[PDB]
């Protein structure tokens, strides 16, 4: 989880994943 | 049994080292983040 480098303006969005990471 | 357990225990050790030291170790996951975010970027640039 440290080795990756994962913002909305207009109409864009990011729904959250259903299975949260502390469930996964 | 005793030696086999050591090889296995040792092999697991090198993993985090090879993972921590060598960057670009998660090339596959990073693209699917890079591409899918690069593609969004072009979608917004097109508003201008």
């Amino acid at each position: 989880f440290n080795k990756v480098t994962l913002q909305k303006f207009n109409g864009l969005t990011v729904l959250p994943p259903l299975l949260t990471d502390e469930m996964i | 049994q005793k030696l086999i357990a050591n090889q296995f225990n040792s092999a697991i050790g090198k993993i985090q080292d090879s993972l921590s030291s060598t960057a670009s170790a998660l090339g596959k996951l990073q693209d699917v983040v890079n591409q899918n975010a690069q593609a969004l970027n072009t979608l917004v640039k097109q508003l201008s």
Binding site: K8, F9, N10, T13, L15 | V44, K45, Q46, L47, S48
Partner: protein
């Protein structure tokens, strides 16, 4: 001018909407506004006060309802996506 209420503003011809907040963004005495990307005017200095403000468009999201079916019931919930529980 007002603040923190999303208003149909008109700064010097720049016609938009959104909430206006005081800016910490270091302008220069010859900079009139900023745009982060895609012609999104993000900041602007008012013409009179010479004060720099940030413009974030007032919150919006989808609304999706949660029904158990129709034959089962007609009671529903409603989800206001990615909105703090302070708006309607």
């Amino acid at each position: 001018l007002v603040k923190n209420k999303c208003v149909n503003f008109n700064f010097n011809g720049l016609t938009g909407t959104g909430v206006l907040t005081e800016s910490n963004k270091k302008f220069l005495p010859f900079q009139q506004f900023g745009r982060d990307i895609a012609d999104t005017t993000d900041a602007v200095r008012d013409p009179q006060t010479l004060e720099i403000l940030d413009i974030t468009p007032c919150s919006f999201g989808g609304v999706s309802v949660i029904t158990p079916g129709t034959n089962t019931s007609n009671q529903v919930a409603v989800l206001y996506q990615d909105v703090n529980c302070t708006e309607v």
